[PDB]
From a paper:
The P. yoelii RH protein, termed Py235 (235 kDa in mass), has been shown to be a potential virulence factor that allows the parasite to invade a wider range of host erythrocytes. In erythrocyte binding assays (EBA) it has been demonstrated that Py235 of P. yoelii binds strongly to erythrocytes in the presence of ATP, whereby weak interactions have been found in the presence of ADP or the absence of nucleotides. In this context a 94 kDa domain of Py235 of P. yoelii, which is highly conserved amongst the RBLs and called the nucleotide-binding domain (NBD94), has been found to selectively bind ATP and ADP. Based on these traits and the absence of significant ATPase activity of NBD94, this domain was suggested to serve as an ATP/ADP sensor during the invasion process.
The second domain, NBD94566–663, covering the amino acids close to the nucleotide binding segment NBD94444–547, has been crystallized by vapor diffusion using 2-methyl-2,4 pentanediol as a precipitant in a form suitable for X-ray diffraction analysis. Peak wavelength (0.97898 Å) data was used for the SAD technique in which 12 out of 18 Se sites (6 SeMet in each molecule) could be identified by SHELXD that were further refined by SHELXE. The electron density map for the main chain atoms is excellent showing the typical sausage like features for the helical regions, whereas for the side chain atoms no visible densities could be identified. The structure of the NBD94566–663 molecule consists of two helices that are linked by a loop, which is not visible in the electron density map. The length of the long and short helix is 97.8 Å and 48.6 Å, which are formed by 65 and 30 residues, respectively. Due to the kinks from residues Tyr60-Lys62 and Ser85-Glu87 both helices spread apart by an angle of 40.2°, thereby forming a hinge-like feature. The longer helix of chain C in the asymmetric unit is highly distorted when compared to the other molecules. By contrast no nucleotide-binding could be observed in the constructs NBD94566–663 and NBD94674–793. In the crystallographic structure, the residues Gly61 and Ser85 of the N- and C-terminal helix, respectively, are in a very close proximity of 9.8 Å and the very N- and C-terminal amino acids of NBD94566–663 spread apart by an angle of 40.2°. This structural feature of NBD94566–663 enables this protein to move either like a hinge or like a rattle up and down, thereby transmitting ATP-ADP modulation in NBD94444–547 with up- and down movements in NBD94566–663, which have to be coupled to the α-helical and chair-like NBD94674–793 fragment of the C-terminal region of NBD94, representing an elongated protein with three subdomains of 96 Å, 35 Å and 20 Å in length.
Residue numbers in the entry: 7 to 72, 76 to 107
């Protein structure tokens, strides 16, 4: 204990300098969620692109490209009439919240 005061130093270099590792040991699991974050974000933003061309852009272009009108009817118009799913989502939210 006298010279073996270097045992409290060992005690320190132990637990104290051991729990030093169990910090960066969570810094990895962090750099996983952090990693996953953008890793999906961008991947999807890529399939949010294909829409803008195939929708909005290909819309105006096709809505200039021109029975045939019947297709133009069931087109963008019934494509908006799809969004009845929001009402098929609203009252549901307004359900499990009373």
């Amino acid at each position: 204990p006298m010279v073996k005061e270097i045992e409290k130093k060992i005690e320190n270099i132990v637990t104290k300098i051991d729990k030093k590792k169990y910090i960066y040991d969570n810094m990895k699991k962090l750099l996983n969620e952090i990693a996953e974050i953008e890793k999906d974000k961008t991947s999807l933003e890529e399939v949010k692109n294909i829409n803008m061309s195939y929708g909005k852009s290909l819309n105006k272009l096709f809505l200039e490209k021109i029975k045939k009108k019947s297709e133009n009817m069931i087109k963008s118009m019934e494509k908006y009439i799809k969004d009845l799913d929001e009402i098929k989502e609203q009252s549901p939210k307004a359900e499990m919240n009373t």
